[PDB]
From Swiss-Prot:
Catalysed reactions, as listed in the record: D-glucose(out) + H(+)(out) = D-glucose(in) + H(+)(in); D-mannose(out) + H(+)(out) = D-mannose(in) + H(+)(in); D-galactose(in) + H(+)(in) = D-galactose(out) + H(+)(out)
Topology versus the membrane: Multi-pass membrane protein
Cytoplasmic side: 454-487
Name of the featured protein: Sugar transport protein 10
Chain segments annotated as transmembrane: 1-19, 66-86, 93-113, 115-135, 150-170, 184-204, 265-285, 300-320, 330-350, 369-389, 408-428, 433-453
Known outcome of mutating C429A: Increases sensitivity to alkaline pH and can only function fully at acidic pH (pH < 5)
C-alpha cells in the first residue's frame, strides 16, 4: 500500500461522479417548468397548476419512454464496445472515452435549443456511462493491493453517491434562478467529465492490462511503483500466469460460455439484475412523490431527496470500512436483512396509517417516519448491493473475460435500471405502497441466493480468485485445477 496507488485509485474512482450526477440531476430538472415548456409542452400543460403532481410521473407515454430509455440503451451498447477497447487498448482508454462522451453530451444538453440536441446529449451521456462504468471498476480492482481492493474499488460507488447528492444540491440552487436554471444543472455535468478526461491522461494503466498487451517491462516497473517495492516477483508471477492463459483467448465473447467461466458469468449476470430489483431507484423517489401529493411543495420534496442523499453517501463508509476486514458476505447479508425489514415496515406502516387515521390524509409526522424508514433501507443498500454491485463482478473474472464480464454487468444493469424504473413509475406516482412488499420478496430471494452461492472474495489477489470458486461447495465442479493461479 503506497500513497501513489491510493491517489491513483481516488482519481480513477471519480469516474463514478458521472453516472451519479446524472442519477441525481434528472428528477429536479424535469420538475423545472422552464425546461418542460421548452422541450415537453405536453407535460408542461399537465403540470400547470398541478400542485400535487410530480413532473417525471408524466413521462409514461411511448415517445417519452423512448427519450428516457435512450440513455440506458446507449449505455448498454457502449458497454459492449468498451469491453473490446478496454482489453485491446487498456482500461485508461475506455475511461478517457467515457469522460469525453459525457463531456460532449453535457454541452449538447446545456446549450440545447431543441429536443434534437437533448436527444443527442442524452445518448452521449449514455455512451459516457457505458464506457466509464465498464472500465473504472476493472481499473480499481486490478490497481488496488489485494488486501484493500474492496475499499478502493468502492471509491467508485462513493463517487456515485457524491454525484447524486451534489446534483440534488445543484438543483436546489438552480431552481432559484430567474431563468436558465436547467442549463446550469445539465451543464455542470461537464465539470466531473473534464476531471475524468484529464485524469485518464495522467493515470497509469494497470500492470495486468499492460502485460496482456505485451508491455512486459513497463508492466513490471508499474507494479513495483504502485506496490512501492523492488521485489514484486510473487505478484508479478500471478500476472505472468494470468497473461499466459489470457493470450490463448482471442475472442472472450466466444469463450465466456465455457464451463470454467460459469460462476463468473452467472454472477456478472445476476448481480446487476438483483441490484436493481432491490427497488432502489423506485423507493428513492417514494418520499419525494409522497411529500408533493401531501401539499408540501417542490422544495420539501427536493429536501427529502437531499436528506436521503446524505444518508446514501455517508452509509457508503460502512462498506469501505468493513468490506476487506469482515468480507463481502457479511455486507450482503446484513444489508439484505435490513432492507427487507425496512420494506416490510414501510409497507405495513403506510397500510396501517390509513386504517387508523379517519381523515384519509397522512400527517406530516407520518410522512417523516416514512422517510425515516426509507432512509434506513437506503443505508442498507448503500453498504451492500450498491457498492458490491460494482465491486464483485470486477473481482471474480479471469483476466481474459474480465472486461467482458464487467460489460455484462453494466449492460444488464442499465437494462434493468430502465425496465424496473419505468415499470413501477405508475405505482410510484399513485402511491401504491404494495410495491414495498414486492421488492421485499425480491430482496429475500437475492439474499438467499448470496447466502448459498457467493464465496467470500476478500483479500484474495485478483488473478488467484479461481482458488475461491474451487473451494465452494457448488461451484467447485466448474473450476479445473490447471486453471488456478497461485495457491
Ligand atoms: C453506441 C451509441 C448508442 C447506440 C444506441 C442508440 C439508442 C437510440 C435510442 C433512442 C433515441 C431516440 C429517442 C427519441 C426521443 C423522442 C422524444 C420526443 O418525441 O419528445 C418530444 C415530445 O414527445 C413532445 O414535445
Ligand atoms: C467532436 C464534436 C465536438 C463537439 C463539442 C461539444 C459542442 C457541441 C454542443 C453544443 C452546440 C454548440 C453551438 C451553440 C449554438 C447551438 C445552436 C445550434 O447549433 O442550432 C442548430 C440546431 O440544428 C437548431 O436548428
Ligand atoms: C478542472 C475543471 C474544469 C471545469 C470546466 C467546466 C466547463 C463547463 C462549465 C459550465 C457549463 C454550465 C453552464 C452553462 C449555462 C449556459 C446558460 C446560458 O447560456 O444562459 C444565458 C442565456 O443563454 C442568455 O441568452
Ligand atoms: C426463497 C425466498 C422466498 C421469498 C418469499 C417472500 C417472503 C415475503 C416477502 C414479502 C412480503 C409479501 C407480502 C406480505 C404482505 C401481504 C399482505 C398485504 O399486503 O396486506 C395488505 C395490508 O393492508 C397490509 O399493508
Ligand atoms: O447510490 C444509489 C446508486 O447506487 C448504484 O450502485 C446503483 O447502480 C444505482 O442504480 C443507484 O442509483
Amino acid at each position: 500500500v503506497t500513497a501513489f496507488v491510493i491517489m491513483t485509485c481516488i482519481v480513477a474512482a471519480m469516474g463514478g461522479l458521472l453516472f451519479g450526477y446524472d442519477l441525481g440531476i434528472s428528477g429536479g430538472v424535469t420538475s423545472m417548468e422552464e425546461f418542460l415548456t421548452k422541450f415537453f409542452p405536453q407535460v408542461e400543460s399537465q403540470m400547470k397548476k398541478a400542485k400535487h403532481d410530480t413532473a417525471y410521473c408524466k413521462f409514461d407515454n411511448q415517445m417519452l419512454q423512448l427519450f428516457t430509455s435512450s440513455l440506458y440503451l446507449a449505455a448498454l451498447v457502449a458497454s459492449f464496445m468498451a469491453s473490446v477497447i478496454t482489453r485491446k487498448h487498456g482500461r485508461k482508454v475506455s475511461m478517457f472515452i467515457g469522460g469525453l462522451a459525457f463531456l460532449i453530451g453535457a454541452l449538447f444538453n446545456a446549450f440545447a435549443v431543441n429536443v434534437s440536441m437533448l436527444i443527442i446529449g442524452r445518448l452521449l451521456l449514455g455512451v459516457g456511462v457505458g464506457f466509464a462504468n465498464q472500465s473504472t471498476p476493472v481499473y480499481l480492482s486490478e490497481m488496488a493491493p489485494a488486501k484493500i481492493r474492496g475499499a478502493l474499488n468502492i471509491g467508485f460507488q462513493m463517487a456515485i453517491t457524491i454525484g447524486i447528492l451534489v446534483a440534488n444540491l445543484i438543483n436546489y440552487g438552480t431552481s432559484k434562478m430567474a431563468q436558465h436554471g436547467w442549463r446550469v444543472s445539465l451543464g455542470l455535468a461537464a465539470v466531473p467529465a473534464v476531471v475524468m478526461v484529464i485524469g485518464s491522461f495522467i493515470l497509469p494503466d494497470t500492470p495486468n492490462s499492460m502485460l496482456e498487451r505485451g508491455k512486459n517491462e513497463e508492466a513490471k516497473q508499474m507494479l513495483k511503483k504502485i506496490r512501492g517495492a523492488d521485489n514484486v516477483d510473487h505478484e508479478f508471477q500471478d500476472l505472468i500466469d494470468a497473461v499466459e492463459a489470457a493470450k490463448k483467448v482471442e475472442n472472450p465473447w466466444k469463450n465466456i460460455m465455457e464451463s470454467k467461466y460459469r460462476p463468473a458469468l452467472i454472477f456478472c449476470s445476476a448481480i446487476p439484475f438483483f441490484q436493481q430489483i432491490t427497488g432502489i431507484n423506485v423507493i428513492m423517489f417514494y418520499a419525494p412523490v409522497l411529500f408533493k401529493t401531501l401539499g408540501f411543495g417542490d422544495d420539501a420534496a427536493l429536501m427529502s431527496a437531499v436528506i436521503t442523499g446524505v444518508v446514501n453517501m455517508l452509509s457508503t463508509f460502512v462498506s469501505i470500512y468493513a468490506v476487506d476486514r469482515y468480507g463481502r458476505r457479511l455486507l450482503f447479508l446484513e444489508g439484505g436483512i435490513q432492507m427487507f425489514i425496512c420494506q416490510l415496515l414501510v409497507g405495513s406502516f403506510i397500510g396501517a396509517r390509513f386504517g387508523t387515521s379517519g381523515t384519509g390524509t397522512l400527517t406530516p409526522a407520518t410522512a417523516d417516519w416514512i422517510l425515516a424508514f426509507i432512509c434506513v433501507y437506503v443505508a442498507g443498500f448503500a453498504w451492500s448491493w450498491g457498492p458490491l454491485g460494482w465491486l464483485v463482478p470486477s473481482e471474480i473474472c479471469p483476466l481474459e473475460i474480465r472486461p467482458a464480464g464487467q460489460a455484462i454487468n453494466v449492460s444488464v444493469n442499465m437494462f434493468f435500471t430502465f425496465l424496473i424504473g419505468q415499470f413501477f413509475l405508475t405505482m410510484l406516482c399513485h402511491m401504491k405502497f404494495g410495491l414495498f412488499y414486492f421488492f421485499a420478496s425480491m430482496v429475500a430471494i437475492m439474499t438467499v441466493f448470496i447466502y448459498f452461492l457467493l464465496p467470500e472474495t476478500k483479500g484474495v489477489p485478483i488473478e488467484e480468485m479461481g482458488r475461491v470458486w474451487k473451494q465452494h461447495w457448488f461451484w467447485k465442479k466448474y473450476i479445473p485445477e490447471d486453471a488456478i493461479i497461485g495457491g
